[PDB]
């Protein structure tokens, strides 16, 4: 006869969700938040003979990252001055001192009556605004968000510069990692390991090109939830970076205005030197080679004799239409069409626009005002992937068009988190044995 034997410490687990905590290695928000020290010795345990199922499109780690980022962002802006005394009629004319012709009409010089230290007195001040920040009332203008939202000035001392962060399991939980090179995001993964914390991920936000992510181990990878359903996005991970050099080639003056009792507004003052358009430099040859690699891989799902064409976005608000880029403390909206105009069978120099009043998260009630950054800005970053959408399909054309559709803030993070899964450890269990308790 056999009897039940109870074992505690059995190495088994179930799929599970739990809050993960952040850890990492100034006035930076990420540094302040992920105050927990990182793992100085990030040991990884190979699990011999373990096959596990992963699904990046259902991976709740991305949802947590999204929610926590929004929360951190709001806590950072919560205590900053509210620019409600600023929603006034502005009297504006164009900036005309040293305007090159591609900048004409983009930068405006606006005068207004603002509250001083005492509530009994007004002062006449002026500042510069970008065209996209200001709308006409009918030379009478108002800030673009006056009839929908409050405008909060971001504090000039707070840094949002991305710092790699690591997600770590709480006790009783573990994170499994997929090491199967060329894993497509779903189904079984034959080679896995157990870790305590994820690798570092930079909490970068972008809309069309994916910036400063990890690279594919061997070849360009193409992943999609459905692939054949044209309503879904296609994520492309490059196995090599494309270097992109961006600039806002001006000399800004920051000026401070008291708007109340210790309440300061940071305004954009006169530009020293020429006024020029913001732009990004993408190496032409590099872009042509990595695009060619993407096409070679796209064909696996579309056909070896199918024409693959790239085209620009369909149009609409700049948040989706253009490549939104946050760097140097300024918000850029880059045209991007020079990167997606080819048919498959030196430099590019993409123009960019600058905007200061940003509705960053897709919410209506609150807008953030980015104070100007003094001086001149230079940014160098890696394009590590693309968010593409497909316009119809080859069905009755033998031609397909791909566009830099973008559209989901989470897509810039699931592209890093696709290798990780959270599981719950369940140590108690039973099995029959050839023994009996002797009472």
């Amino acid at each position, epitope marked *: 006869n056999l009897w039940v034997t109870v074992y505690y410490g059995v190495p088994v687990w179930k799929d599970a969700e739990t809050t993960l905590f952040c850890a990492s290695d100034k006035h930076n928000v990420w540094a302040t938040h992920c105050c927990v020290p990182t793992d100085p010795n990030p040991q990884e345990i190979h699990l011999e003979n373990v096959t596990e199922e992963f699904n990046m499109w259902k991976n709740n780690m991305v949802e947590q990252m999204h929610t926590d980022i929004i929360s951190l962002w709001d806590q950072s802006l919560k205590p900053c001055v509210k620019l409600t005394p600023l929603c006034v009629t502005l009297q504006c004319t164009n900036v*005309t001192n040293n305007i090159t012709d591609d900048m*004409r009409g983009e930068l405006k010089n606006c005068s207004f009556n603002m509250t001083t230290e005492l509530r009994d007195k007004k002062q006449k001040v002026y500042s510069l605004f970008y065209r996209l920040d200001v709308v006409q009332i009918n030379k009478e203008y108002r800030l673009i968000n006056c009839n929908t939202s409050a405008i909060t000035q971001a504090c000039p001392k707070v840094s949002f510069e991305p710092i790699p962060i690591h997600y770590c399991a709480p006790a009783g939980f573990a994170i499994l990692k997929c090491k199967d090179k060329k894993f497509n995001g779903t189904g079984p993964c034959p080679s896995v390991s157990t870790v305590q914390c994820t690798h570092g991920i930079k909490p970068v936000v972008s809309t069309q090109l994916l910036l400063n992510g990890s690279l594919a181990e061997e070849e360009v990878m193409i992943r999609s939830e459905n692939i054949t359903n044209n309503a879904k996005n296609i994520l492309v991970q490059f196995n090599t970076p494309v270097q992109i050099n961006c600039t806002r080639p001006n000399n800004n003056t920051r000026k401070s205005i008291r708007i109340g009792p210790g309440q300061w507004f940071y305004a954009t003052g006169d530009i020293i030197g020429d006024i020029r358009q913001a732009h990004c430099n993408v190496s032409k040859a590099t872009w042509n080679e990595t695009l060619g690699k993407v096409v070679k891989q796209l064909r696996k799902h579309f056909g070896n004799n199918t024409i693959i064409r790239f085209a620009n976005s369909s149009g609409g608000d700049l948040e989706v239409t253009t490549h939104s880029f946050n760097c140097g403390g300024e918000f850029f909206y880059c045209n991007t069409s020079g990167l997606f105009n080819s048919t498959w069978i030196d430099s590019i*120099t993409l*123009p960019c626009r600058i905007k200061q009043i940003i509705n960053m998260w897709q919410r209506i009630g609150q807008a953030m005002y980015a104070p100007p950054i003094q001086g001149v800005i230079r940014c160098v970053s890696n394009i590590t992937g693309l968010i593409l959408t497909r316009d119809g399909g080859s069905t009755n054309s033998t031609t397909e068009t791909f566009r830099p559709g973008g559209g989901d803030m989470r897509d810039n993070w699931r592209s890093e988190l696709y290798k990780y899964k959270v599981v719950k450890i369940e140590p108690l269990g039973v099995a029959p044995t050839r023994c009996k308790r002797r009472v």
Partner: antibody
Amino acid sequence: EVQLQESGGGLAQPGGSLRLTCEASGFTFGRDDMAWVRQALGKGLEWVSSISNSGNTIYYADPVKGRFSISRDNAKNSLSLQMNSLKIEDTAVYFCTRTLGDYYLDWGQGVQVTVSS
Amino acid sequence: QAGLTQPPSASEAAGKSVTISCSGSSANIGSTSVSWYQQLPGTAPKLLIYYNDQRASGVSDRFSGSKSGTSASLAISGLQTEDEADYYCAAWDDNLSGRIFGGGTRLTVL
């Protein structure tokens, strides 16, 4: 420093065409915008056309709309103007000039263009 | 016909003081800056004044100027026979997108 306007003009009969060209030296051609200014003999100056340094923004004066076309190379440090359907009224000295917002800065040489029988 | 207008002649002085002026409308001088050019017979114009009152490099204290309303002026305190030229004002026009000039004022020193 100089334009060394190339004298791509000359004598043309009405209805014909001429292409004016302009060089650049001591000037980082690819950075600044440029324009053409016309001066009839015995008359004051008038604007004909302009082009931005990127080559993307182009404007023309009313009397030459349709007929004239302006372009830039940006590798050879040169600029040009193709003037089609020339009229007697277009006889003038044409000047090549470098500009900044709201003013002309570097002017030079000048080319006589004559339209006649 | 110039978009801007100005007197055909200012040859009424010697003795270190003459004023040359021009005018437009709110679509031009009233909304943007004014520049002045000096043309000697036989050559290309030289820049004297830009952005209302800044001297171009190489321009002496003999020249000055200002802008008000929808009009502007050039002040010359030299009037040596060296300052013999056709002077023009110019400005960016907003309806006609370009940098346009007035008729030109001829100044001969007495």
